[PDB]
Write a protein that holds these residues in place. Structure first.
Motif, PDB file in Angstrom:
ATOM      1  N   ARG E  13      47.605  27.138  44.049  1.00 49.55           N
ATOM      2  CA  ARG E  13      47.920  28.553  43.889  1.00 49.55           C
ATOM      3  C   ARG E  13      49.337  28.930  44.332  1.00 49.55           C
ATOM      4  O   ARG E  13      49.926  29.870  43.798  1.00 49.55           O
ATOM      5  CB  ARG E  13      46.886  29.397  44.642  1.00 49.55           C
ATOM      6  CG  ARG E  13      45.483  29.335  44.039  1.00 49.55           C
ATOM      7  CD  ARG E  13      44.491  30.164  44.842  1.00 49.55           C
ATOM      8  NE  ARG E  13      43.145  30.148  44.266  1.00 49.55           N
ATOM      9  CZ  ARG E  13      42.078  30.696  44.846  1.00 49.55           C
ATOM     10  NH1 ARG E  13      42.201  31.299  46.024  1.00 49.55           N
ATOM     11  NH2 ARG E  13      40.889  30.639  44.257  1.00 49.55           N
ATOM     12  N   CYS E  14      49.881  28.193  45.298  1.00 47.93           N
ATOM     13  CA  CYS E  14      51.178  28.524  45.899  1.00 47.93           C
ATOM     14  C   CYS E  14      52.195  27.398  45.779  1.00 47.93           C
ATOM     15  O   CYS E  14      51.929  26.345  45.197  1.00 47.93           O
ATOM     16  CB  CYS E  14      51.023  28.852  47.389  1.00 47.93           C
ATOM     17  SG  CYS E  14      49.770  30.059  47.848  1.00 47.93           S
ATOM     18  N   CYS E  17      51.185  24.556  48.576  1.00 47.60           N
ATOM     19  CA  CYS E  17      49.808  24.049  48.538  1.00 47.60           C
ATOM     20  C   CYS E  17      49.784  22.552  48.123  1.00 47.60           C
ATOM     21  O   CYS E  17      50.576  22.132  47.281  1.00 47.60           O
ATOM     22  CB  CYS E  17      48.942  24.907  47.583  1.00 47.60           C
ATOM     23  SG  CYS E  17      49.036  26.765  47.699  1.00 47.60           S
ATOM     24  N   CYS E  30      46.831  24.516  52.133  1.00 47.87           N
ATOM     25  CA  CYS E  30      48.112  25.216  52.284  1.00 47.87           C
ATOM     26  C   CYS E  30      48.430  25.430  53.748  1.00 47.87           C
ATOM     27  O   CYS E  30      47.707  26.157  54.426  1.00 47.87           O
ATOM     28  CB  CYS E  30      48.112  26.597  51.629  1.00 47.87           C
ATOM     29  SG  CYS E  30      47.581  26.794  49.946  1.00 47.87           S
ATOM     30  N   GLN E  33      49.312  30.553  54.540  1.00 44.72           N
ATOM     31  CA  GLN E  33      48.260  31.293  53.832  1.00 44.72           C
ATOM     32  C   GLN E  33      46.984  30.471  53.620  1.00 44.72           C
ATOM     33  O   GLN E  33      46.671  30.084  52.494  1.00 44.72           O
ATOM     34  CB  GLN E  33      48.779  31.793  52.484  1.00 44.72           C
ATOM     35  CG  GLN E  33      50.067  32.596  52.569  1.00 44.72           C
ATOM     36  CD  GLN E  33      50.551  33.059  51.204  1.00 44.72           C
ATOM     37  OE1 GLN E  33      49.979  32.697  50.174  1.00 44.72           O
ATOM     38  NE2 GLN E  33      51.609  33.866  51.191  1.00 44.72           N
ATOM     39  N   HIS E  36      43.983  30.103  50.887  1.00 39.61           N
ATOM     40  CA  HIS E  36      44.129  29.378  49.637  1.00 39.61           C
ATOM     41  C   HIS E  36      43.429  28.028  49.635  1.00 39.61           C
ATOM     42  O   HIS E  36      43.473  27.295  48.644  1.00 39.61           O
ATOM     43  CB  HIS E  36      45.590  29.154  49.346  1.00 39.61           C
ATOM     44  CG  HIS E  36      46.318  30.370  48.898  1.00 39.61           C
ATOM     45  ND1 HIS E  36      46.238  30.835  47.603  1.00 39.61           N
ATOM     46  CD2 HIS E  36      47.162  31.208  49.547  1.00 39.61           C
ATOM     47  CE1 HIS E  36      46.981  31.918  47.480  1.00 39.61           C
ATOM     48  NE2 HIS E  36      47.560  32.164  48.646  1.00 39.61           N
TER      49      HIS E  36
END
Ligand SMILES: [Zn+2]
Lengths: 323, 125, 56, 52, 53, 155, 102
Positions: E13-14, E17, E30, E33, E36
């Motif tokens: 997602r990031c 990650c 991650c 955050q 996630h």
């Protein structure tokens, strides 16, 4: 009754004064070679550079006193300029927190909205509305495009006939209707029959073709040498030939050797004939006389003059390392 | 009228490979029964993800309704939704499938996204 | 009645000029680099910001 | 300081197959050809809607 | 961490990650955050035969 | 945006007359009535759109003797539009500067017929724009997964 | 062939829904002749990717593909679903020793 320059296609640059003072004010400070930490762009009016919100904030954001740039810009830009002309100012800030700004003529949107006699928010993309905004001739597009060169040092480059399309297509993108193009006909001429117009067209277009041709010829002659070397066409290659040629190196470099101008160094029948037959072993292009190999495979974006020069054994027979 | 439990049985695999007039389509991959409310949920969820300026969602509801409550008995390969262009906008497969992905969950049985023209049912299945 | 195919009088078994369009979404193997690209390491593309910025 | 630049013969002596640009424009040719038959594919799929 | 049904339902997602292995179970971590984080749902790290199939 | 837009709109000045034969106003109508409708798109979706701001005089609109209000400097006189043939490659542009849908250029190249030699270059730049569109996301998908069209569109 | 749906029945032992004598291309072509009176060379048949390795072998609805070779001579296009293929639809039903074979 008067017609200013009646000559086949020399209206290219603007007049003298505009060119030279656009040279000494719109200009290139040379890149010092430092690490740029900010590339900033602003739209700033001619007579007024302010310490107000955008420029003052971004200079106080680095701790820099914004008064100096404002004063220098006002000293450089207040003379020589008609009012209410918003200019592109690109400030480049390096790691020493010393900066260099370039002054550049207004954006193309500005010129288009000037030339169309249209204020802001009066024009948009066509499917968004379903009707064209103002009509424009390709005559006007040139005098818009004349104003934006790549480098004011050399106005000729890039060439109008190409870069005009950027203007045409951006105007297009704005929703401007056009004459030469997007409508079948060309704006009426009072004094001439249609066949006279078209007969004029068929000679004029090829005159412009010739001029353009020689122009990009000496263009290419100013360039570094590697563009005058051999990049053969990959399209005439049967796509399986291309991918299998990417699978092994020898197909492509034997190809390159086989299709090459006959220059003293690379003109060798002994290494050429076995190259051709080595290509023809595997079903690569076989219907070839070598001299039509030199035609089918050649740099295609290479202009006409130096490509007939390379095709010709005589003109290229002369380039030889002396000593 | 007053049809028995074995009637309009979806369970057979059909010979008709559908022809979708719209640019993209959503097509039944399995056998099943679908409620109208489920297709309405799907429709709304798909209309959330469409650029209504360039596109129109066509729902094929004209099939018979069978008593359970009235629902549809769907054979494999029956088309459901169609993305129809109003302009030159040409979607990729990722985009179209990303659009139908919203409305897939509401539909109880497996569905495939199929491109304009006739279903190539060698590739789909 | 028994049913059988006609013989081949002319032309190829698989339709050439009559091909049905193939029903996949046509992503080029080199346009989307995923698999099936056998590219000699001499010919490796798209390094423009990594190793093909300092070529040859 | 006199700059008499490298001439055509001198530099064309070193002309040679450059596999970098060969590979690159081979790949780009492949890509324009697959874009070609992608447009062709959309055309065929659209004309597949024609009555027999 | 949320447990995805299988490996295909697993996305990054990031920017930060990563794919990692929790004892043969594929998962996503991650360092920034943590919301996630994704696990592939699979057997417990310690299982016997009668206890877990 | 309200940045980089003219806050004033000066007028046209017509310096010299492009013709010596003055038109009847019925000629000025019959040419204008010809202008108000134009074609948009070049493909199967092709729609006639009515054009706003069609000038009173068609004959004198852009083709000579008009000075554009694009002047910038103080001593810059409004540039007078010269004759057509003195502008380079304009007849050649009229052929090729038009919306070219990709499919359609392609079919021309296959048939080895181009309206202008340049439409090669028109094609090659379209492909490169498309593939760039592919090359961008493939630098964006690398850093983080970016899913195409799952978000709700609008409000 | 596609309009027709070839009924098939056999014997199944074990837990999940498998035939203990899996199908192959010589007896798909057999059922074609048995109930549809269709005579084709069995080597024109091709299975699904999942069924190539084990045979067909699973109860219920299966489909297979028949290659009809010659038609571009006949100008066959758009009047069929595709020019080279027929989806041959098999249904395998489990039956006891009374009614089944093999
Ligand atoms: Zn995350």
């Amino acid at each position: 009754p008067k017609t200013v320059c009646v000559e086949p296609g020399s209206n290219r640059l603007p007049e003298a004064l505009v060119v030279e003072k656009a040279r000494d004010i719109f200009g290139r400070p040379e890149f010092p070679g430092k690490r740029v930490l900010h590339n900033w762009r602003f739209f700033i009016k001619a007579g007024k550079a302010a310490t107000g919100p955008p420029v003052g904030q971004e200079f106080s954001k680095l701790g820099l006193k914004a008064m100096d740039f404002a004063k220098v810009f006002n000293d450089r830009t207040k003379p020589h300029f008609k009012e209410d002309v918003e200019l592109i100012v690109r400030i480049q800030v390096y790691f020493d927190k010393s900066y260099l700004f370039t002054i550049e003529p207004p954006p193309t949107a500005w010129f288009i909205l000037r030339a169309l006699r249209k204020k802001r928010r009066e024009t948009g993309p066509v499917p968004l509305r379903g009707h064209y905004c103002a009509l424009m001739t390709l005559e006007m597009a040139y005098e818009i495009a004349k104003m934006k060169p790549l480098c004011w040092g050399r106005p000729e480059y890039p060439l109008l006939e190409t870069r005009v399309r950027r203007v045409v297509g951006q105007a297009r993108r704005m929703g401007v209707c056009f004459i030469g193009v997007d409508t079948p006909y060309s704006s009426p001429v009072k004094d001439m029959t249609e066949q006279q117009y078209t007969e004029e067209c068929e000679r004029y277009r090829r005159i412009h073709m010739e001029q353009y041709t020689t122009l990009r010829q000496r263009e290419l002659e100013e360039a570094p040498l590697i563009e005058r070397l051999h990049r053969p066409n990959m399209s005439p290659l049967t796509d399986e030939q291309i991918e299998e040629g990417l699978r092994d190196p020898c197909l492509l470099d034997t190809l390159w050797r086989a299709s090459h101008p006959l220059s003293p160094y690379h003109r060798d029948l002994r290494e050429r004939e076995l190259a051709r037959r080595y290509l023809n072993a595997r079903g690569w292009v076989k219907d070839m006389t070598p001299e039509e190999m030199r035609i089918v495979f050649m740099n295609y974006r290479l202009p006409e003059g130096e490509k007939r020069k390379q095709m010709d054994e005589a003109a290229m027979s002369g380039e030889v390392y002396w000593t | 009228i007053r049809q028995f439990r074995r009637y309009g049985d979806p369970r057979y695999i059909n010979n008709e490979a559908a022809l979708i007039r719209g640019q993209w389509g959503l097509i039944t991959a399995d056998f099943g029964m679908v409620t109208q409310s489920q297709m309405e949920n799907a429709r709304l969820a798909i209309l959330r993800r469409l650029p209504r300026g360039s596109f129109t969602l066509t729902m094929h509801t004209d099939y018979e309704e069978f008593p359970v409550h009235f629902a549809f008995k769907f054979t494999t390969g029956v088309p459901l939704f169609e993305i129809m262009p109003i302009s030159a906008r040409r979607l990729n497969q990722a985009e179209a499938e990303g659009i139908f992905l919203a409305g897939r969950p509401f539909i109880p049985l497996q569905t495939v996204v199929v491109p304009q023209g006739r279903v190539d049912e060698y590739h789909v299945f | 009645r028994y049913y059988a195919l006609p013989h081949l009088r002319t032309g190829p078994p698989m339709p050439t000029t009559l091909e049905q369009p193939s029903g996949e979404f046509p992503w080029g193997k080199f346009s989307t680099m995923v698999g099936g690209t056998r590219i000699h390491p001499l010919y490796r593309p798209d390094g423009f910001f990594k190793d093909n910025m300092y070529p040859a | 300081l006199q700059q008499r630049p490298v001439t055509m013969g001198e530099y064309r002596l070193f002309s040679v197959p450059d596999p970098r640009e060969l590979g690159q424009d081979a790949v780009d040719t492949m890509r324009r050809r697959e874009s070609h038959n992608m447009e062709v594919w959309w055309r065929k799929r659209k004309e597949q809607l024609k009555p027999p | 961490p949320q447990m995805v049904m299988s490996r295909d339902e697993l996305k990054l997602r990031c920017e930060y990650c990563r794919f990692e292995w929790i004892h043969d179970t594929l998962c996503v971590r991650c360092p920034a955050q943590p919301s996630h984080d994704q696990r592939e749902m699979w057997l417990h790290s310690t299982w016997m035969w009668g206890k877990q199939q | 945006k309200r940045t980089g837009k003219p806050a004033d709109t000066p007028d046209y000045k017509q310096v010299y007359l492009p013709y010596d034969a003055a038109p009847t106003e019925r000629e000025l109508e019959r040419e204008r009535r010809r202008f108000k409708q134009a074609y948009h798109g070049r493909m199967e979706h092709r729609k006639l759109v009515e054009v706003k701001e069609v000038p009173l005089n068609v004959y004198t609109y852009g083709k000579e003797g008009m000075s554009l209000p694009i002047a910038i400097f103080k001593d810059q006189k409004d540039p007078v539009i010269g004759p057509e043939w003195t502008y380079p490659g304009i007849y050649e542009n009229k052929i090729a500067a038009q919306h070219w849908y990709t499919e359609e250029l392609f079919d021309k190249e296959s048939k080895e017929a181009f309206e202008s030699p340049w439409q090669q270059q028109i094609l090659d730049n379209q492909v490169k724009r498309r593939m760039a569109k592919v090359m961008f996301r493939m630098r964006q998908v690398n850093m983080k997964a970016v899913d195409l069209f799952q978000k709700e569109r609008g409000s | 062939v596609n309009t027709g749906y070839l009924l098939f029945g056999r014997q199944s032992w074990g837990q999940g829904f498998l035939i203990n004598c899996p199908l192959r291309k010589r007896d798909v072509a057999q059922k074609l002749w048995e109930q549809y009176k269709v005579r084709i060379d069995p080597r024109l048949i091709e299975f699904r990717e999942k069924d190539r390795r084990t045979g067909i072998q699973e109860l219920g609805h299966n489909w297979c593909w028949l290659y009809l070779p010659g038609a571009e001579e006949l100008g066959i296009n758009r009047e069929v679903y595709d020019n080279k293929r027929v989806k041959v639809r098999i249904h395998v039903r489990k039956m006891n020793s009374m009614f089944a074979l093999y």
